[model samples]
Target: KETAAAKFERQHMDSSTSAASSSNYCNQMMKSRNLTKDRCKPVNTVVHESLADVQAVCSQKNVACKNGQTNCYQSYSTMSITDCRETGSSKYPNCAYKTTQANKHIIVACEGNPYVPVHFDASV
Candidate 1:
């Protein structure tokens, strides 16, 4: 004779076991936008050497990059490059002449699944 409480516990345990055996994991932040048949893989820029490099990389990724006087990388995305005074030459350097001081964004695209999961500490 099976008790009602025991039956319910068994059912719940069975469901839990089934879910655990399934492909979906509890810790995975996987998106449902999968388009390929193979296992998904993540893609992102591992490193950037300088601001100009970042700009060039962004251009390669089809994103937008702007130039400015003080900090070209920090400027608006309107492509409005402004001139700035040179540090020692006392000459105004054009927007195209400016440079960035750090790396830029990491745009991960996809031939199938764009596993765009960014994980970093970025400690200050």
Candidate 2:
């Protein structure tokens, strides 16, 4: 069953990525990954690691999510990620995003019998 967990992978996972090699990565990737399907996500982080690695965060221990949900867990190991911050250079026509790379412990929300990440809550 490809639920929100699958959506999480599609939205956040990016194992094969190169720093400085990508120019306007969010522009191309956001489109390719369907981030613009319903609405444009003004801000989002892409974890540069395998899906298997990120799935391990589900067992890190429960933590309160930004919305005060207790289903979230924080990763013990630091992971490489790129934050795509919308520049809003063009308000009406398009949204411009700039990427900033960082290594941080990611916070994720998991659900279901298999126990996989369904949402990315935060980073620490």
Candidate 3:
């Protein structure tokens, strides 16, 4: 007879409830609806740095951060920025770095079919 809020409170009161449970909830709901891989994906800007600034200065600056998109690649999917260098080899070949107006947050994205948020992944 508990309300939905009460139910969630009870379910999470365990404290031991893991983040995996929450992620699975989202995955199950999205899968049940048969949303496309793209539809399940989430993107946000993680960092903003001036392209004109010296490399070291820009690198040292705090890039807005989120989940997966801390590096030059995967930025669109996760909405984060990091000191990640483009020279390193990556699983995704097409990833690269680019500049924008007045230094802006770079969009990052999540990876995988179930569409777990990028922050839940290691990139965060």
Candidate 4:
């Protein structure tokens, strides 16, 4: 079984590709990263920052989760990232996505030992 922190890393981390210029970025990545297995992840993000920098977000300003949980945190500085949103015509087994690159402060939920990021809430 995969750990929450590890899952977050697989789904959200992408340090090598800071600039996602190609329109096919999300389409390729969503499938390549296994996010399109059973169904498309309606919305997801890939943070183009070092793991250490991302992990440090847990120590940033605390915030409330969408469900009103108290363990969320927001990054203090803007970071490079690519946002992937499912296309209107997308269907199962043929997930399509629209990719947009931007720099934004990320919001994440943390948990467990050492209190590390477990979920990517959003980017703002």
The candidate maximizing lDDT is 4
Report lDDT (CA) for all predictions: 0.22, 0.81, 0.27, 0.91
Off by over 4 Å in 1: 1-48, 63-105, 108-124
**Per-residue error at 82 for model 2, in Å?**
0.7
Q: How many steric clashes does model 3 contain? A: 19
Ranked by lDDT, the better of candidates 2 and 4 is 4
Determine which window of 10 residues in candidate 2 has minimal summed lDDT. Answer: 88-97
User: Tens-digit lDDT track for model 4 on 1-124?
Assistant: 9999999998998888766759999898888889999888899899999998999999998999998999999999999999999998999988999989999999999998888999999888
Ranked by TM-score, top first: 4, 2, 3, 1
Which residue pairs show collisions in model 1?
none
Residue 28's lDDT in candidate 2: 69
Query: TM-scores for all candidates?
Result: 0.15, 0.88, 0.16, 0.94
Off by over 4 Å in 4: none
Best TM-score goes to which candidate? 4
Instruction: Give the candidate order by descending lDDT.
Output: 4, 2, 3, 1
Q: Which has the better TM-score: candidate 1, or candidate 4?
A: 4
* Backbone clashes, candidate 4: 0
Report model 3's TM-score to 2 decimal places.
0.16
What's model 1's lDDT at 36?
15
Local lDDT at 82 for model 3:
24
Error of 2 at 29 (Å): 1.6
Per-residue error for 74 in candidate 3, Å, reads 16
